[PDB]
Amino acid sequence: TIDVLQFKDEAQEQQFRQLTEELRCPKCQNNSIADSNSMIATDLRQKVYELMQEGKSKKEIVDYMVARYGNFVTYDPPLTP
């Protein structure tokens, strides 16, 4: 059990699935911000949650991430081969 960050169902978590795994982390040995559980990764995932209820689109969520948090985050194909 995490926080106020709740998924309405598995589908909302599938949205989370994309919204965290479409985000690029600058390390070949790291699974984006999804299950990395990184302190700062969680910080970003909060944004992913907020943007859900704000009414953002998938690329819009990650764009919001990269626009506001584009120091660490980046919108690009991840370490997925």
Q: Report the alpha-carbon distance of residue 35 to residue 60 in Å, rounded.
A: 21
Q: Report the alpha-carbon distance of residue 18 to residue 21 in Å, rounded.
A: 5
CB 24 within 8 A of CB 77: yes
The strand pairing partners of 74, in sequence order, are 24
Place of tokens 């985050």: 73
- Tokens at 20, concatenated: 């965290």
CA atoms in the 13 A half-sphere facing the CB of 74: 10
Domains of the chain: 1-81 (1.10.8.640)
Q: Report the alpha-carbon distance of residue 45 to residue 22 in Å, rounded.
A: 12
Q: Report the alpha-carbon distance of residue 31 to residue 36 in Å, rounded.
A: 6
- Tokens at 31, concatenated: 């699974």
